[PDB]
Write an enzyme that holds these catalytic residues in place. Structure first.
Site, mmCIF file in Angstrom:
data_model
loop_
_atom_site.group_PDB
_atom_site.id
_atom_site.type_symbol
_atom_site.label_atom_id
_atom_site.label_comp_id
_atom_site.label_asym_id
_atom_site.label_seq_id
_atom_site.Cartn_x
_atom_site.Cartn_y
_atom_site.Cartn_z
ATOM 1 N N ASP B 14 0.815 -1.246 0.000
ATOM 2 C CA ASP B 14 0.000 0.000 0.000
ATOM 3 C C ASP B 14 0.835 1.275 0.000
ATOM 4 O OD1 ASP B 14 -1.823 -2.055 0.663
ATOM 5 O OD2 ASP B 14 -3.141 -0.678 1.731
ATOM 6 N N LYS B 17 4.696 0.792 -4.209
ATOM 7 C CA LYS B 17 5.791 0.225 -4.993
ATOM 8 C C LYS B 17 5.411 -0.038 -6.460
ATOM 9 C CE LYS B 17 5.877 -3.129 -2.147
ATOM 10 N NZ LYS B 17 6.306 -4.523 -2.431
ATOM 11 N N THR B 18 4.194 -0.535 -6.684
ATOM 12 C CA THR B 18 3.720 -0.811 -8.039
ATOM 13 C C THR B 18 3.508 0.494 -8.794
ATOM 14 O OG1 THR B 18 2.542 -2.868 -7.373
ATOM 15 C CG2 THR B 18 1.934 -1.898 -9.502
ATOM 16 N N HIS B 54 9.775 -12.520 1.930
ATOM 17 C CA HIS B 54 11.116 -12.838 2.361
ATOM 18 C C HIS B 54 11.596 -14.180 1.766
ATOM 19 C CE1 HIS B 54 14.342 -12.477 5.562
ATOM 20 N NE2 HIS B 54 14.501 -13.716 5.126
HETATM 21 N N1 GDP Z 1 -1.717 9.888 -2.735
HETATM 22 C C1 GDP Z 1 -0.927 8.998 -3.300
HETATM 23 N N2 GDP Z 1 -1.381 7.747 -3.484
HETATM 24 C C2 GDP Z 1 -0.512 6.884 -4.063
HETATM 25 C C3 GDP Z 1 0.769 7.200 -4.466
HETATM 26 N N3 GDP Z 1 1.359 6.075 -5.021
HETATM 27 C C4 GDP Z 1 0.425 5.102 -4.935
HETATM 28 N N4 GDP Z 1 -0.708 5.569 -4.377
HETATM 29 C C5 GDP Z 1 -1.956 4.837 -4.110
HETATM 30 O O1 GDP Z 1 -1.746 4.000 -3.004
HETATM 31 C C6 GDP Z 1 -2.482 2.778 -3.265
HETATM 32 C C7 GDP Z 1 -1.519 1.609 -3.303
HETATM 33 O O2 GDP Z 1 -0.446 1.833 -4.219
HETATM 34 P P1 GDP Z 1 0.216 0.548 -4.918
HETATM 35 O O3 GDP Z 1 1.208 0.937 -5.989
HETATM 36 O O4 GDP Z 1 -0.838 -0.390 -5.455
HETATM 37 O O5 GDP Z 1 1.042 -0.084 -3.693
HETATM 38 P P2 GDP Z 1 1.949 -1.393 -3.608
HETATM 39 O O6 GDP Z 1 1.139 -2.521 -2.996
HETATM 40 O O7 GDP Z 1 3.142 -1.030 -2.728
HETATM 41 O O8 GDP Z 1 2.421 -1.812 -4.976
HETATM 42 C C8 GDP Z 1 -3.208 2.953 -4.605
HETATM 43 O O9 GDP Z 1 -4.536 3.455 -4.394
HETATM 44 C C9 GDP Z 1 -2.323 3.973 -5.323
HETATM 45 O O10 GDP Z 1 -3.018 4.701 -6.348
HETATM 46 C C10 GDP Z 1 1.213 8.584 -4.243
HETATM 47 O O11 GDP Z 1 2.323 9.043 -4.536
HETATM 48 N N5 GDP Z 1 0.296 9.416 -3.647
#
Ligand code: GDP
Ligand code: CL
Ligand code: CL
Lengths: 280, 363
Positions: B14, B17-18, B54
């Site tokens: 969340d 990263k993606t 991990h």
């Molecule tokens: N406000 C904000 N939301 C972000 C940002 N980057 C990602 N998000 C949101 O955070 C949520 C999770 O991001 P995601 O890339 O899917 O996280 P991951 O599980 O680490 O790959 C999604 O709703 C994204 O659109 C950012 O720079 N700012």
């Protein structure tokens, strides 16, 4: 009181709560740390609710013995990074201790007692966390085995020393019998399996009189392989666990094996595909 | 033929990263033109994986996925580090990731600079607690999302991150630039020329006139290369990746054997005892059907040959099941040329049942 970087730090050092959650709570609380903590409690229930629909198929099995009474426990989370975290571990150990001390086998009783602590942990960690199941084993002699965090086993026995119980628990971890003895398999189940195998054998072109005799052999193999005493002992497979127990003048009166994520389908992810979607 | 760098993202589910990775591809394509993702800066080509688990990461590292030359620790500035952030960094420390760059995400959601500072200092402290250079760590303040949506100010910070990938991760070493090493596959003698060993040059370059050491299994010997040939045709040098026959001065057929290596003198040593990270194949991957225990006595396949070894399991571990990954200390029955990072197969009866990587040489 004024809301300084220092005060925020103190609430964060104190709760592990997100930096912004801390500033917001503390601000609404006019700088009262204890009130901020209480505010963050009500918020946390909603943060946890958001996560509660997330598949949590990682986590730990834990076991603990108190004399003639043992508990085995599954606590789930989403990633093995959190399963290794010291806070998650301490939570799972706390739940385990209480189940033993209180002889708690109803996972809903256990869930209710720890729900607020669960929510605070989820609000910190940002993964769904679930107390999934708990079971007790009772016995003359009890032993346990943990195969890392992922498989836990309790074994109940009679006339077995510490080492033998342990080896039997290791065997159960590796070979997952679902009965103690082949005679424990019910006549109903055996007759169903007989019909399965006779059906398979017949359509493969085996004449009926031949298929019947072959399937009676398959039934001995079947009850042997789902039962503890009928299985080859993993540490010396030239003998069954039954022969092992006879050699030691021992018997097994019970066992339970839990494995993390059993019966949970884990979420398949394609990072490359997901990245492509977002950009296009 | 630009340099190849393997990177990866690690961080809380969340924290973005993606989204960050999508923003990296998008902005670099927009700026410089055009399971893993790829992208390019003017001077570097990147291969980028995610590190969701991990054990999964350790397993993929052992079973062939190239190791990260650098990792991007993604931490949302709204939260700061999570309790499991030390487990993310601890993975990095475990697998020897040599460099970590931090991307502070979601800075579009945070106004107070003094709070960003608090988050930044927490990260530097965490990094240092696990012996990464926290004080010198590049930390970029960005928004993965707003950059992905084409916001100019935030696009810059993506370019800044790519800038640090370029400058802070050293250009990885090409095989041909490394000290000469050839794993010896076969050996024979030529009446009027002498002893020839064959194999595929693993790294560097061997030329006529250069000294080599013969290392592993038996006592190290030294010789001089008097010829290099390919398909019965004489060459002046053999290069990384070429299959060659190396002609040797003085040394005889029966003094060299398969499993030894030819090497630039002084650059590789023989060892018998080492720590490793090991992965045991599951039954479905064609591995063992049953667990092994403390007295398990397999072969360790290094480059071209099996060497029997005995194993020491970590404290508290008494059984290894198919599909497990574990650390083990290995003592071979005779020495073999090795250094940290050398990959090997584990075999029994000549069948591969596992894989490992040398983590630390002991003796
Ligand atoms: N406000 C904000 N939301 C972000 C940002 N980057 C990602 N998000 C949101 O955070 C949520 C999770 O991001 P995601 O890339 O899917 O996280 P991951 O599980 O680490 O790959 C999604 O709703 C994204 O659109 C950012 O720079 N700012
Ligand atoms: Cl039954
Ligand atoms: Cl064994």
């Amino acid at each position: 009181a004024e809301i300084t970087a220092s005060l925020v730090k103190e609430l964060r050092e104190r709760t592990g709560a997100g930096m912004m959650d801390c500033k917001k709570a503390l601000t609404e609380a006019n700088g009262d740390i204890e009130l901020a903590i209480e505010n963050m409690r009500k918020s946390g229930a909603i943060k946890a609710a958001k996560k509660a629909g997330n598949v949590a198929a990682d986590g730990v099995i834990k076991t603990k013995i108190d004399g003639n009474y043992g508990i085995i426990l599954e606590v789930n989370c989403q990633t093995d990074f959190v399963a290794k975290d010291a806070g998650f571990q301490a939570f799972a150990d706390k739940v385990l201790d209480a189940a033993v001390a209180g002889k708690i086998t109803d996972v809903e009783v256990l869930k209710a007692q720890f729900e607020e602590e669960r929510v605070a942990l989820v609000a910190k960690i940002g993964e769904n966390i679930n107390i999934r199941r708990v079971a007790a084993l009772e016995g003359d002699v009890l032993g346990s085995y943990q195969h890392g965090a992922r498989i836990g086993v309790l074994v109940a026995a009679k006339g077995a020393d510490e080492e033998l119980v342990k080896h039997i628990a290791m065997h159960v971890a590796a070979s997952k019998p679902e009965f103690i003895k082949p005679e424990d398999v019910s006549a109903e189940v055996v007759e169903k399996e007989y019909q399965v195998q006779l059906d398979i054998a017949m359509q493969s072109g085996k004449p009926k009189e031949i298929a019947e005799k072959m399937v009676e052999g398959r039934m001995k193999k079947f009850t042997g392989e789902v039962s503890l005493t009928g299985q080859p002992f993993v540490m010396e497979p030239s003998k069954t666990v039954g022969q092992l127990l006879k050699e030691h003048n021992a018997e097994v009166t019970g066992f339970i094996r839990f494995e993390v994520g059993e019966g949970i389908e884990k979420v398949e992810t394609d990072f490359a595909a997901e990245v492509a979607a977002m950009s296009k | 033929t630009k340099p190849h760098v393997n990177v990866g993202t690690i961080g809380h589910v969340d924290h973005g990263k993606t989204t960050l990775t999508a923003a990296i591809t998008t902005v670099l394509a927009k700026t410089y033109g055009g399971s893993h993702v790829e992208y390019d800066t003017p001077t570097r080509h990147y291969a980028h994986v995610d590190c969701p688990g991990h054990a999964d990461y350790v397993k993929n590292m052992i079973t062939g996925a190239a190791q990260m030359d650098g990792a991007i620790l993604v931490v949302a500035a709204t939260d700061g580090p999570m309790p499991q952030t030390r487990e993310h960094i601890l993975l990095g420390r475990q697998v020897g990731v040599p460099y970590i760059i931090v991307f502070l995400n979601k800075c579009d959601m945070v106004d107070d600079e003094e709070l960003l500072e608090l988050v930044e200092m927490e990260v530097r402290e965490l990094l240092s607690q696990y012996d990464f250079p926290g004080d010198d760590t590049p930390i970029v303040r960005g928004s993965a999302l707003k950059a992905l949506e084409g916001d100019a100010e935030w696009e810059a910070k993506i370019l800044e991150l790519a800038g640090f990938l370029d400058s802070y991760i050293p250009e990885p070493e090409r095989a041909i630039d490394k000290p000469f090493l050839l794993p010896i596959e076969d050996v024979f003698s030529i009446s009027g020329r002498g002893t020839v060993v064959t194999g595929r040059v693993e790294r560097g370059i061997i030329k006529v006139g250069e000294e080599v050491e013969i290392v592993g299994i038996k006592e190290t010997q030294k010789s001089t290369c008097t010829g290099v040939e390919m398909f019965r045709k004489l060459l002046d040098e053999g290069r990384a990746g070429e299959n060659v026959g190396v002609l040797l001065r003085g040394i005889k057929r029966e003094e060299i054997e398969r499993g030894q290596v030819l090497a630039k003198p002084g650059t590789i040593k023989p060892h018998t005892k080492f720590e490793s990270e090991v992965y045991i194949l599951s039954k479905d991957e064609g591995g063992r059907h049953t667990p092994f225990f403390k007295g398990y006595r397999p072969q360790f396949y290094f480059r071209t040959t099996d060497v029997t070894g005995t194993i020491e399991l970590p404290e508290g571990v008494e059984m290894v099941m198919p599909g497990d990954n574990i650390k083990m200390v290995v003592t071979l029955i005779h020495p073999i040329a090795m250094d940290d990072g050398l990959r090997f197969a584990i075999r029994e009866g000549g069948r591969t049942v596992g894989a490992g990587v040398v983590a630390k040489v002991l003796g």
